[PDB]
UniProtKB/Swiss-Prot annotation:
The gene is PB2. A motif (Nuclear localization signal) lies at residues 52-55. Plays an essential role in transcription initiation and cap-stealing mechanism, in which cellular capped pre-mRNAs are used to generate primers for viral transcription. Recognizes and binds the 7-methylguanosine-containing cap of the target pre-RNA which is subsequently cleaved after 10-13 nucleotides by the viral protein PA. Plays a role in the initiation of the viral genome replication and modulates the activity of the ribonucleoprotein (RNP) complex. Belongs to the influenza viruses PB2 family. It is found in: Virion; Host nucleus; Host mitochondrion. This is Polymerase basic protein 2. Influenza RNA polymerase is composed of three subunits: PB1, PB2 and PA. Interacts (via N-terminus) with PB1 (via C-terminus). Interacts with nucleoprotein NP (via N-terminus). Interacts (via N-terminus) with host MAVS (via N-terminus); this interaction inhibits host innate immune response. The chain holds residues 685 to 759 of 759 of the full protein. It comes from Influenza A virus (strain A/Victoria/3/1975 H3N2).
Length: 75
């Protein structure tokens, strides 16, 4: 997960769920709420939302193998 890599605390969601309509910056991503997502650019060209920690993690284990969404279910 190159997206979450830089962040060092998010998960790899994807370019969907535009229902959020955030499009904010990373500096604000930290103010987000756990279990929630937020669309942030990772190259000024790809708009994808991230997924906060499911509880607690230093860098939040992730993987770029799942771009559609994350490999975890939050309820």
């Amino acid at each position: 997960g190159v997206e979450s890599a830089v962040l060092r605390g998010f998960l790899i969601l994807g370019k969907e769920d535009r229902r959020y309509g955030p499009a904010l910056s990373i500096n604000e991503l930290s103010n987000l709420a756990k279990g929630e997502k937020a669309n942030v650019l990772i190259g000024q060209g790809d708009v994808v939302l991230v997924m906060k920690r499911k509880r607690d993690s230093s860098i939040l284990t992730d993987s770029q193998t799942a771009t559609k969404r994350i490999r975890m279910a939050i309820n």
